Design a protein around this ligand. Structure first.
Ligand code: FES
Length: 93
């Protein structure tokens, strides 16, 4: 499917393959850097993005630990495993 990434007011549609994480999709497109990050291991909390539209499974306890001091709609890109149900979801970087 595909999701919409929004960086600097500019919308960019990206295609994703089932079971790919938003982190993988985002970083492999140059929209998000994987430098100094745990490389999508949900341990550094640097892959922050904002879920603004679409269906995305609620965050688990471990991820929530990293979003306590973040905006209400913040999520860890690597904590989100993309599947058909996420087709059309929009995220703001
Ligand atoms: S890449 Fe480290 S928490 Fe997502």
């Amino acid at each position: 499917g595909t999701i919409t990434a929004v960086k600097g007011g500019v919308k960019k549609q990206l295609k994703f393959e089932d079971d790919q994480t938003l982190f993988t999709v985002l970083t492999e497109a140059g929209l998000m850097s994987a430098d100094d990050t745990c490389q999508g291991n949900k341990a550094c909390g640097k892959c922050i993005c904002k879920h603004v539209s679409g269906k995305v499974a609620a965050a688990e306890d471990d991820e929530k630990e990293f979003l306590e001091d973040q905006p209400a709609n913040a999520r860890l890109a690597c904590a989100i495993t993309l599947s058909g149900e996420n087709d059309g979801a929009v995220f703001e970087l």
